[PDB]
Amino acid sequence: CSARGLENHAAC
Amino acid sequence: IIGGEFTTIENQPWFAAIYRRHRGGSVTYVCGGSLISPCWVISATHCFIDYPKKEDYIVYLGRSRLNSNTQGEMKFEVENLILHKDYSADTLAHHNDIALLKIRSKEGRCAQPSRTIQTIALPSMYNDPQFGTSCEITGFGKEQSTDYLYPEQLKMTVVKLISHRECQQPHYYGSEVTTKMLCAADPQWKTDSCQGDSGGPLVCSLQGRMTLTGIVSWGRGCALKDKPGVYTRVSHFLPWIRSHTK
Numbered sequence A: 001c002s003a004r005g006l007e008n009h010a011a012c
Numbered sequence B: 001i002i003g004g005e006f007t008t009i010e011n012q013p014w015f016a017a018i019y020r021r022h023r024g025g026s027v028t029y030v031c032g033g034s035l036i037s038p039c040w041v042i043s044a045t046h047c048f049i050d051y052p053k054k055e056d057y058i059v060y061l062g063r064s065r066l067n068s069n070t071q072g073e074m075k076f077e078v079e080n081l082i083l084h085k086d087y088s089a090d091t092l093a094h095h096n097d098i099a100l101l102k103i104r105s106k107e108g109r110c111a112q113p114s115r116t117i118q119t120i121a122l123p124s125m126y127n128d129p130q131f132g133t134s135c136e137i138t139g140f141g142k143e144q145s146t147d148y149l150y151p152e153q154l155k156m157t158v159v160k161l162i163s164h165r166e167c168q169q170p171h172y173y174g175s176e177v178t179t180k181m182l183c184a185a186d187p188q189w190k191t192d193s194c195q196g197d198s199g200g201p202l203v204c205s206l207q208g209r210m211t212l213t214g215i216v217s218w219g220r221g222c223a224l225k226d227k228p229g230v231y232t233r234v235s236h237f238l239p240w241i242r243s244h245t246k
Helices: B239-242
Strands: B013-023 B027-037 B039-042 B057-061 B076-082 B099-104 B134-139 B153-164 B181-185 B201-206 B209-218 B227-233
Touching: B027 B057, B039 B209, B057 B099, B057 B209, B076 B201, B134 B209, B181 B209
Parallel strands: none
Antiparallel strands: B013 B027, B013 B057, B027 B039, B039 B099, B057 B076, B076 B099, B134 B153, B134 B201, B153 B181, B181 B227, B201 B209, B209 B227
């Protein structure tokens, strides 16, 4: 979550 | 962008700033993208997959600052949000991480090219620069991995392309990287893309032409030794792009 690939994800 | 330098939209006038409106009305930054024709922006599917409804998004072009209007900018709704059918994700790696947004203003218009708003060329098929070539990345993503805030001013940096064969080594990413991805990094690992840079452009000069070589996709951390940035390899998706651009 602190990095690239999870931008705009409900679980972050 | 870790390291690198501040810039403005004149230096990357195809850069698109994508935001999401919330229930209750707050607006937050999502991801970058690139203007490839007046009515189309290209980005990464992982930016949208958890909220895949087009009415949730707002796209700016000609914008140099995250939370303040830039003179000359244009604002667009998303008329269509096209995600790649074969998207998947690992714990780290995202496959087929490519998305198209068709943009339309409240007045029903597409982008109008200006000093601050221009399209970027797509690469010829299967035609990428040689490893070790220097290319540029642009975005509003974090300046340090531990930051809480995104920078208010656009940034860009330079990274060098890494061979398949090198990016494939266990102590890099082993099997996580495919032939439809491109790795790029700094030789001292001191500059990179980071969180919030996803969807944005990796641009290389190809036959004297500035070309959308990659789309920011994934990485383990940011500016981390033996952990390059990983980019969707645009030259391997030209039929997909051609077909979906309706």
